[PDB]
Amino acid sequence: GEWEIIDIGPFTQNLGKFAVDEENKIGQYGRLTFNKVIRPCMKKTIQVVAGYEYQLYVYASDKLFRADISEQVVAGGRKLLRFNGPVPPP
Amino acid sequence: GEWEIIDIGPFTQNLGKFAVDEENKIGQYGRLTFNKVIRPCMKKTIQVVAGYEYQLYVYASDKLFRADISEQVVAGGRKLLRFNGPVPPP
């Protein structure tokens, strides 16, 4: 639950474009036209996941082997979670 | 690059089954028959990735909204990386 303000501009301005698009795909606020993302833009840490590489000694056909197995963690894509409004300026 | 021994048994024994199967699917050690995973079974941390939830103030159709956007991180599946041998007992 750690928080962090990120400065506006390119990245956040494309988060707003993203947010408006995916909202229009449900559409039941009508058809919205993206304008701008204003301060403050907040970033909450909701998880920390570790990727692992297992190293095993394995008997197969009663021969011994060294196998390495990854359990990689993937940064997936952006998904719009909530979209409510209108709201007062912060 | 942090290391950790994990005790053998169910989980590691299924990592060895996994490792032998996915090896047979390239097959060019022939056809191997899984027997057992022995100590020590090692676990290396190869990454730490955080999932995020962005909270934005967005003007759309000159109305202000509160949008929340997740950038979830996914624990993907196991992939056999390397498989060499035979080797001496450790």
Author numbering:
A (entry chain A), B (entry chain A): 2 to 91
Quote the original article.
The QVVAG segment was next introduced simultaneously into two different loops of MNEI, with the aim of designing two swappable domains in it. L13MN was crystallized, and its structure was determined by X-ray crystallography to a resolution of 2.3 Å. The atomic structure of L13MN revealed a domain-swapped dimer, which was constructed by a novel criss-crossed arrangement of the two polypeptide chains contributing to the dimer. Both loop1 and loop3 acted as hinge loops, and adopted an extended conformation in the dimer. Swapping via loop1 results in an exchange of β1-α1-loopA-β2 and β3-loop2-β4-loop3-β5 sub-domains. This results in a reciprocal exchange of more than one sub-domain between the two L13MN polypeptide chains, forming a dimer where the β3-loop2-β4 hairpin from one polypeptide chain appears to have “inserted” into the neighboring polypeptide chain. The parallel arrangement of the two subunits in the L13MN dimer results in the stacking of four QVVAG stretches, generating a small hydrophobic patch at their interface. The number of contacts (including van der Waals contacts and hydrogen bonds) observed at the secondary interface in L1MN is 15, whereas the same in L13MN is 66, indicating significantly higher integration in L13MN.
In domain swapping, two protein molecules exchange “domains” or structural units connected by a hinge loop, such that intermolecular interactions replace the intramolecular interactions at the dimer interface of each monomer. We then show that engineering the QVVAG stretch simultaneously into two different loops of MNEI creates two swappable domains in it, resulting in the formation of a double domain-swapped dimer.
